[PDB]
């Protein structure tokens, strides 16, 4: 046992002011080179310092916890059009969500809005709308096999404001018959 | 310190880089745990983020806001719109460089910010020159044609990553005006 | 630990027979190791190297003992072990050339001129 | 204690702060050199006066010395004082006892005042000639290869045996190279017109080609290219659209 | 202790010995754990540093009477010697990180080979100083010396003397096949007879200019 | 434990000297051989016993190869 224990792979992590034959002690890295777990701890330090400054009104909800992958399942619900446990209809995070999500918050203001099938030019223009709530539809269980949360923001970024374009056109009365045929031209 | 840098760089800042419209992102920067040596890395890494942040935040504000239609040059216009788009196409590598560094983050999240700001290194300089051209733009309130001018000659340019960079834009900016023609012609 | 054990791990280490299939070579080993357990000739650890020393020069690489004077030191250095007379003279009785008399040259006490 | 425990663990934590050294290495001698040249004076009676400083230990310098070299400022040696960089005088190893220390860092500090220099150029240009623009690109495109050495010892740190000699060695076949931009930033600072300071800044690396004529010559030579890229823009435009423009002349015919 | 020592026998001072300018690295501190003989052994060590020392000041101004590229290859020659006295001062403090035993008498042994070199060719450049050599006759001066007396002399100058040939392979390539000279300083025009070395005979630098004469027409 | 560690770190360096030490002395053992042969006399047993063994058991093994 102990000379099956012997066969050890010698010290190079070995300091020059230790002449006593280290093992090794471990380099000690550098400050930011922690940035996963002491980064996590520092963020809820820095809150708690916070709020001993504040008095303790402010009470996080954890918006810390959960991770990565749990939110990227929530947020592709929200694609869906079925909105998240934070929204209705660390920290730095729910500025992230913010922006995608309001895209799902107005997606399902887009769907709501389309409930018909007065007005047939204004009916069949209303399916046409349909037609691209269903490529944004298309677009997501396709494309992510769950991916990372910052290519989602990134990915959605250049078409959410598409989307977020054909809001302004809708209300969210309204033009219809010659008015809305000439209009549209 | 590692994925935080990536959450503030991305345009979705935290509440450690509290965010002015006259400094720009900075660090919280209160600590007898912090030190000069990341502070000088920190602040050239802010430079860039809020570069990221008011390119944007220009294509959002010209892009997204009006169907197609002041009739001042300088606010409104089709040339500017087709600017933007040019702009956003030419932001990115930027994303792809951060999604790429988030990567073998997870992987080992152990590396350091020096790897991060030698990786950076090369947009630190593109940045600011494309920073003047869209800042002159909106300073002279510059109308039509003109502006097609303004940009050009920034695009004789004797760097190859800022004059490459302006030429693409300028290109969607001719072909607006060709399509024009496509018609007046 | 027990030494009896240990005897047969050489058997299997020197033939590449199993354990289950010497049995005689480690039959005629209990034989030679037991009744002969206990020293014969007095312990030097010292007498040792100062004999391979001694070698070393009579066949003349004397930088080569001075080499052997490091290791010693570094022995003495580690001291970790509670016999170290036995493994080098054990190395020294099963020496082979690299690539004459020693009947002059002097031997070790006989434990009869000595304690018994 | 929960953040300074976690702290004490993965970070150093003892000397960019007011805290003393507590790191019992192996003592004797050999790295016990600075109590025991404390205890030599004492002995010779000089007579007293006990310096205070921190007592750092070795390879935190290493880390220092790179992340200075690799071309950020402001750490916690090497302060400039007046515009040319001083080492911290509070600052002692447990061997070499706060004067031959000052000596290597000395030497130290006499490269990292032309990176320094040459740095603060360039963020000079964050803050029509364009030559100088067309001088700091070239500048750069040195820089980016420079600070991937510097980079790549600075992985190594994380895994081996540190210390001052082994390092240096290594950055010497940079070092070397550096010497040459502080001849032609010279010239190219030596300057009135704007066709004499690109002029004047121009000979200069065309005589030092020639006077070789290894791996100072290629240095040279992808500086020469890119500061001679925009005369040849400019000849070029003259010869195919039959004027010349330029902005500002830096052009030494006058029409 | 063993590094302060292995920088000052290196280009650094130290501050146990000290440096001077009519003659440094001089030991002048006391103490009870080495023994009173020790100094004096030292002082035989401290003769080697010396000559270093003086070695990169005079590398450190190059790499009138004494100028040229000729003074930028004679000093590269006296880099390429003291490179293995570079490399065998790393590999000591190798062994001293795992040693703690060893005697000074190791080094002072280890390095005893460039106790004949540096003195020796010390006089070799004091020699191309207080004469103004800076032409064609420091081939001369090599090769006169590079018959040596002693093995490892023998081979150093041999290093420096190659890189001297090796310019004279380009002035009489751009001469004997283009017609040029004159893109170096010197030592219709022709060869100075008097910067010539004796090895080289006065029928075959005839020839040379003959042969590089008839190109230019 | 940590001085137990550095302990097997010193009957590593004692183990290679003895390896130095036997390719000089260019006996027919490997490394984990003698290893065996260092636990039998550290807990005491004949030199000039285990030495008659391993040398006819090297000719015992040249016998039907």
């Not at chain 1, 280290?22 to 916070?50: I, N, S, V, W």
């Not at chain 2, 720009?24 to 942040?53: A, K, M, W």
């Not at chain 4, 420079?146 to 045996?161: G, Q, R, S």
């Not at chain 5, 004096?40 to 010396?50: D, F, P, Y």
Request: with cysteine; hydrophobic share 40%; glycine share 6%.
């Amino acid at each position: 046992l102990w000379e099956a224990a012997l066969t050890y792979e010698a010290s190079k992590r070995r300091c020059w002011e230790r002449v006593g034959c280290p093992p090794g002690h471990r380099e000690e890295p550098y400050l930011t080179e922690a940035g996963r777990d002491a980064f996590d701890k520092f963020c809820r330090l820095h809150q708690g310092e916070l709020q001993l400054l504040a008095g303790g009104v402010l009470q996080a909800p954890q918006p810390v916890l959960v991770k990565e992958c749990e939110l990227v399942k929530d947020v592709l619900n929200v694609l869906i059009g079925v909105v998240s446990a934070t929204f209705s209809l660390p920290e730095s995070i729910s500025s992230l969500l913010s922006e995608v999500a309001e895209y799902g918050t107005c997606y399902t203001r887009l769907s709501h809005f389309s409930l018909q099938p007065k007005g047939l030019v204004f009916q069949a223009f209303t399916s046409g709308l349909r037609r691209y709530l269903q490529y944004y539809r298309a677009c997501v269980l396709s494309t992510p096999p769950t991916l990372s949360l910052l290519t989602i923001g990134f990915l959605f970024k250049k078409l959410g404001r598409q989307l977020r374009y054909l809001a302004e056109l809708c209300g969210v009365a309204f033009p219809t018959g010659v008015k809305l045929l000439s209009y549209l031209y | 310190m590692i994925h935080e840098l990536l959450l503030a760089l991305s345009g979705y800042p935290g509440s450690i880089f509290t965010w002015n419209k006259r400094s720009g992102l900075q660090v919280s920067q209160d600590f007898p745990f912090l030190h000069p040596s990341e502070t000088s890395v920190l602040n050239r890494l802010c430079r860039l983020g809020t570069d990221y942040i008011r390119f944007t935040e220009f294509i959002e504000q010209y892009t997204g806001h009006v169907q197609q239609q002041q009739g001042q040059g300088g606010l409104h216009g089709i040339y500017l719109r087709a600017f933007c788009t040019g702009l956003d196409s030419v932001l990115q590598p930027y994303r792809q460089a951060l999604l790429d560094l988030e990567q073998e983050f997870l992987g080992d999240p152990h590396l350091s910010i020096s790897h991060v700001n030698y990786f950076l290194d090369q947009f630190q300089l593109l940045f600011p020159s494309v920073m003047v051209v869209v800042e002159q733009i909106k300073s002279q309130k510059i109308h039509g044609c003109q502006i097609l001018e303004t940009v050009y000659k920034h695009s004789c340019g004797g760097l190859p990553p800022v004059r490459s960079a302006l030429e693409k834009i300028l290109a969607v900016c001719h072909g607006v005006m060709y399509k024009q023609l496509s018609a007046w012609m | 630990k027990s030494p009896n054990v240990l005897l047969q791990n050489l058997c299997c280490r020197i033939l590449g027979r199993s354990e289950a299939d010497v049995a005689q070579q480690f039959q005629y080993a209990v034989r030679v190791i037991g009744s002969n357990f206990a020293p014969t000739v007095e312990r030097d650890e010292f007498l040792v190297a100062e004999k391979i020393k001694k070698e070393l020069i009579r066949q003349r690489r004397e930088a080569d003992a001075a080499l052997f004077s490091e290791l010693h030191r570094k022995l003495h250095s580690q001291g970790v072990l509670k016999n170290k007379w036995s493994i080098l003279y054990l190395l020294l009785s099963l020496s082979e050339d690299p690539r004459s008399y020693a009947t002059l040259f002097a031997q070790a006490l006989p434990r009869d001129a000595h304690s018994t | 204690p929960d953040d300074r425990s976690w702290l004490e663990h993965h970070v150093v934590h003892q000397y960019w702060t007011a805290r003393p050294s507590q790191f019992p290495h192996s003592l004797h001698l050999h790295s016990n050199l600075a109590a025991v040249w404390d205890q030599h004076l004492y002995s010779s009676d000089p007579l007293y006066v006990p310096d205070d400083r921190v007592l750092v230990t070795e390879t935190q310098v290493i880390r220092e010395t790179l992340w200075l070299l690799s071309g950020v400022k402001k750490l916690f040696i090497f302060q400039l004082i007046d515009g040319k960089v001083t080492v911290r005088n509070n600052i002692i190893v447990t061997h070499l006892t706060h004067s031959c220390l000052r000596s290597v860092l000395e030497q130290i500090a006499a490269y990292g005042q032309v990176v320094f220099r040459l740095q603060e150029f360039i963020d000079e240009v964050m803050g029509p000639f364009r030559t100088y623009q067309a001088f700091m690109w070239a500048l750069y495109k040195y820089f980016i290869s420079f600070k991937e050495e510097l980079a790549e010892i600075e992985k190594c740190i994380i895994n081996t045996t540190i210390t001052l000699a082994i390092v240096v060695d290594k950055l010497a076949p940079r070092l070397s190279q550096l010497k040459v931009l502080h001849k032609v930033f010279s010239t190219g600072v030596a300057e009135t017109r704007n066709v004499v300071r690109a002029s004047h800044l121009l000979n200069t690396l065309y005589k030092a080609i020639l006077e070789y004529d290894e791996q100072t010559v290629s240095l040279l030579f992808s500086l020469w290219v890119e500061t001679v890229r925009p005369y040849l823009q400019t000849v070029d435009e003259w010869i195919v659209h039959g004027h010349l423009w330029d902005g500002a002349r830096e052009f030494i015919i006058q029409r | 202790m063993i590094h302060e020592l292995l920088l000052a026998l290196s280009g650094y001072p130290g501050s146990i010995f000290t440096w001077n300018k009519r003659s440094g690295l001089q030991v002048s501190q006391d103490f009870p754990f080495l023994h009173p003989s020790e100094t004096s052994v030292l002082n035989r060590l401290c003769r080697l540093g010396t000559d270093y020392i003086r070695f990169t000041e005079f590398i450190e101004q190059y790499t009138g009477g004494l100028h040229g590229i000729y003074l930028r290859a004679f000093c590269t020659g006296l880099d390429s010697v003291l490179q293995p006295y570079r490399q065998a001062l790393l590999d000591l403090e190798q062994e001293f990180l795992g040693d703690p035993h060893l005697s000074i008498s190791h080094v002072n042994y280890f390095l005893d080979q460039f106790q004949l070199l540096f003195p020796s060719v010390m006089v070799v450049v004091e020699q191309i100083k207080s004469q103004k050599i800076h032409g064609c006759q420091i081939l001369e001066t090599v090769y006169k010396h590079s018959c040596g007396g002693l093995p490892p002399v023998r081979s150093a100058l041999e290093k420096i003397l190659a890189v001297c040939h090796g310019v004279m392979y380009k002035q009489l390539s751009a001469w004997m096949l283009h017609g040029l000279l004159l893109d170096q300083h010197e030592e219709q025009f022709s060869l100075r007879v008097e910067i010539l070395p004796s090895y080289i005979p006065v029928r075959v630098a005839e020839k040379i200019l003959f042969v590089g004469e008839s190109v230019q027409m | 434990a940590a001085a137990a560690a550095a302990n097997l770190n010193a009957v590593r360096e004692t183990m290679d000297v003895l390896l130095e030490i036997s390719r000089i002395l260019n006996t027919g053992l490997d490394m984990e051989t003698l290893s065996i042969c260092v636990r039998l006399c550290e807990q005491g047993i004949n030199p000039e016993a285990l030495s008659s063994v391993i040398k006819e058991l090297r000719k015992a093994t040249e016998a039907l190869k």
